RNA sequence: CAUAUUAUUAUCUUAUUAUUUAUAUAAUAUUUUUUAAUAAAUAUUAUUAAUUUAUAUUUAUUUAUAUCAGAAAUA
RNA sequence: UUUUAUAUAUAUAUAAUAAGGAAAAGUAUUUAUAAGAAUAUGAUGUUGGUUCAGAUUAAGCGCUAAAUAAGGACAUGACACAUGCGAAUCAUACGUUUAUUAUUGAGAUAAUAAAUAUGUGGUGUAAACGUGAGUAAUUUUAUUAGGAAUUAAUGAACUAUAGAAUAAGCUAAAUACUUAAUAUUAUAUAAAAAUAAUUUAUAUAAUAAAAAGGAUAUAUAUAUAUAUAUUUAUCUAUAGUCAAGCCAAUAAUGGUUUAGGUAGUAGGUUUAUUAAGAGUUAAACCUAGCCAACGAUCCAUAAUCGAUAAUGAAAGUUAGAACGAUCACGUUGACUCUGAAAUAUAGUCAAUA
């Protein structure tokens, strides 16, 4: 037997799924359509570059 | 993985669910230029209190269970400490009965010696060859039987042993001389052949 | 024999603080029983300010435990 | 030797006999690198210490000294400090104050200009900087392809995505504060195995915890509201990034002329507290344990270390100034709020000046 409050086995390794990590961490916008904004275009460009990188 | 140390139980039963385990590890000392064993004693959790002093076990890393206890037993490779108490109790029980039996034998022998004239008796049988005392002595070649000595038994046993040894050896040599006769012996009985011949020849005798 | 500084404590005193007790015609909110002052209409009827009432959040008060630091004793 | 002969009782003694001879031409990198001398002796050899020859400094001093370039600069009193600076910034959060034009009649409201940071607010000072007093480890330093309790419905502050941004009150007014609305864990059912537990999915229970508007334009109508759009803000949720809290193993100075030490002491069982284990702290009940001549406990001393500096052939030895990493401290001690994290260079109390 092991101690009362302990766990017999070590925590199981969390195997990252690259597709899931990409989907959750960087998700493409759902609302593709938008109108003209002076800062919105810049923000969209920066977000696209960061997602790609 | 959780740290794992092989050890020997050196103290048990002193505290509740806790033992001392003797862990040795290999270290290199530069001043000596030597690989030497470095020794420490860990206070270790023993839930179920199975391990006994002298057993060979692991102690494996665990959460802090007390101020000084950070390891728990996992399994007992050698149960020598466990066996040392089972054998102790069994030895006590067996020694008691064996004592009783041998004491009974000694008391019986004391009684025989208490009950307790062979020369006179044997001469009375010899002269006879009167009737009533002779019968009473009979109840108590007959002279030869009453005087047969244990040395004759030793002589005949020694002759038996010597004859057995010599006959075994001479038959082994005889069969080894003729190799085909050895194979015939093997087949009738139904360097490997050497051992088989030896076994069969001794089983014959 | 004399000076000094850290440390402790079955001793004495204790800031502040943390819990813990007991008390508040103590407050503030809200819930009642009520009293004044006021507002619309044909005796009012409700409104704000004060009276009594019982749940919270605290204040004053004291019960105990610990506690900076100080003496006394020891090293 | 081996085999056999004769003789004698499978064995013993004598005699003879022995199978091992083959021939041929041509077909470097070597590594790393350790030197002694003078002084004993009447003289010799040896032991033996002392001193010297080398390199260097966080250096000081005596004598001397031209320029330029770079690297350092209170090691001692963590001793006391005159004086000036080192943390402000936002007028696009809310308020105030003026001046002109317009309409309205001492003022009122707009538009345009400005001032206002002695009023209410937001953000920043847990960092950086300096120091080495304390600390010999009870939480400190170094290292591990070390762990779990199998660390929180933590974001601190940016990225990527979705949503939301409602009502009142008190402030003179608000993006100030309060009250209110709304938006992982524990169970039950199964599944598997990395199983004597964990994970997965489902269905419930509660999650249930918020917010904030400014600056512009326009478009409506009736200065008032409203509706969008652009900008900058706010709150929530998932993931990432940067981060934190706890424990394990090994190592970390001298004195035993400090030999016994420890009673929360060593262990067990519960409960309070934490995000989290544990006599870490608080309470309760049990056991008699735990460390120690491979050096406990006690005392003195000390910030620790490096791919840093010095030195040596090297193992090592010394330093911890300078460059870099960690810790601790900001006159001394304790506690408290906030916060994810502070016994904070904050606050309170006391001590010193
Ligand atoms: Mg325990
Ligand atoms: Mg001389
Ligand atoms: Mg020299
Ligand atoms: Mg210079
Ligand atoms: Mg200094
Ligand atoms: Mg210094
Ligand atoms: Mg303004
Ligand atoms: Mg101001
Ligand atoms: Mg700091
Ligand atoms: Mg610094
Ligand atoms: Mg309002
Ligand atoms: Mg607010
Ligand atoms: Mg506990
Ligand atoms: Mg303790
Ligand atoms: Mg207790
Ligand atoms: Mg010692
Ligand atoms: Mg020091
Ligand atoms: Mg220091
Ligand atoms: Mg340095
Ligand atoms: Mg040192
Ligand atoms: Mg300096
Ligand atoms: Mg501090
Ligand atoms: Mg301080
Ligand atoms: Mg000072």
From Swiss-Prot, chain A:
Signal peptide residues on this chain, from the entry's feature table: none
Compartments, record wording: Mitochondrion
Family: Belongs to the mitochondrion-specific ribosomal protein mS26 family.
Function: Component of the mitochondrial ribosome (mitoribosome), a dedicated translation machinery responsible for the synthesis of mitochondrial genome-encoded proteins, including at least some of the essential transmembrane subunits of the mitochondrial respiratory chain. The mitoribosomes are attached to the mitochondrial inner membrane and translation products are cotranslationally integrated into the membrane.
Extra information: Present with 2010 molecules/cell in log phase SD medium.
Subunit structure: Component of the mitochondrial small ribosomal subunit (mt-SSU). Mature yeast 74S mitochondrial ribosomes consist of a small (37S) and a large (54S) subunit. The 37S small subunit contains a 15S ribosomal RNA (15S mt-rRNA) and 34 different proteins. The 54S large subunit contains a 21S rRNA (21S mt-rRNA) and 46 different proteins.
Protein name as it appears in the record: Small ribosomal subunit protein mS26
Gene that this polypeptide is encoded by: PET123
Parent-protein residues present: 54 to 106 of 318
Swiss-Prot record, chain B:
Disulfide bonds: none
CDD domains on file: Ribosomal_uS17 (cd00364)
Subcellular location(s) per record: Mitochondrion
Signal peptide: none
Record's keyword annotation contains Transcription: no
UniProt keyword annotations, A-Z: Mitochondrion, Ribonucleoprotein, Ribosomal protein, RNA-binding, rRNA-binding, Sporulation
InterPro entries, alphabetized: NA-bd_OB-fold (IPR012340), Ribosomal_uS17 (IPR000266)
Top-rank lineage group of the source organism: Eukaryota
One of the record's GO molecular function terms: rRNA binding
GO biological process: mitochondrial translation; sporulation resulting in formation of a cellular spore
One GO CC term, this protein: mitochondrial inner membrane
Miscellaneous note of the record: Present with 2810 molecules/cell in log phase SD medium.
Protein family: Belongs to the universal ribosomal protein uS17 family.
Assembly with partners or alone: Component of the mitochondrial small ribosomal subunit (mt-SSU). Mature yeast 74S mitochondrial ribosomes consist of a small (37S) and a large (54S) subunit. The 37S small subunit contains a 15S ribosomal RNA (15S mt-rRNA) and 34 different proteins. The 54S large subunit contains a 21S rRNA (21S mt-rRNA) and 46 different proteins.
Reported function: Component of the mitochondrial ribosome (mitoribosome), a dedicated translation machinery responsible for the synthesis of mitochondrial genome-encoded proteins, including at least some of the essential transmembrane subunits of the mitochondrial respiratory chain. The mitoribosomes are attached to the mitochondrial inner membrane and translation products are cotranslationally integrated into the membrane. uS17m may have a meiosis-specific role as it accumulates during the middle stage of sporulation.
The name this protein goes by in its record: Small ribosomal subunit protein uS17m
């Amino acid at each position: 037997k092991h101690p009362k409050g302990s766990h017999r086995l070590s925590p199981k390794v969390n195997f990252i799924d690259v597709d899931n990590l990409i989907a959750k961490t960087v998700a493409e916008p759902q609302s593709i359509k938008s109108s003209n904004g002076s800062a919105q275009k810049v923000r969209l460009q920066k977000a696209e570059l960061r997602r790609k990188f | 993985a959780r740290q794992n140390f092989l050890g020997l139980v050196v103290s048990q039963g002193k505290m509740q669910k806790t033992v001392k385990v003797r862990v040795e590890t290999k270290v290199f000392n530069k001043k000596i230029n030597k690989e030497l064993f470095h020794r420490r004693d860990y206070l270790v959790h023993d839930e179920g209190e199975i391990s006994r002093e002298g057993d060979l076990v692991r102690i494996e890393a665990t959460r802090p269970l007390s101020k000084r206890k950070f390891f728990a037993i996992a399994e007992i490779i050698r149960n020598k400490g466990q066996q040392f108490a089972l054998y102790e109790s069994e030895a006590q029980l067996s020694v008691a009965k064996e004592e009783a039996q041998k004491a009974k034998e000694f008391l019986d022998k004391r009684s025989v010696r208490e009950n307790k004239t062979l020369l006179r008796d044997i001469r009375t049988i010899q002269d006879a060859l009167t009737p009533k005392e002779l019968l009473e002595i009979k109840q108590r070649e007959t002279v030869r039987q009453l005087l047969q000595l244990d040395i004759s038994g030793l002589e005949v046993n020694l002759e038996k042993q010597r004859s057995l040894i010599d006959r075994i050896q001479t038959r082994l040599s005889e069969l080894l001389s003729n190799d085909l006769k050895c194979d015939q012996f093997l087949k009738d009985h139904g360097n490997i052949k050497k051992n088989l011949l030896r076994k069969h020849v001794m089983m014959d005798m």
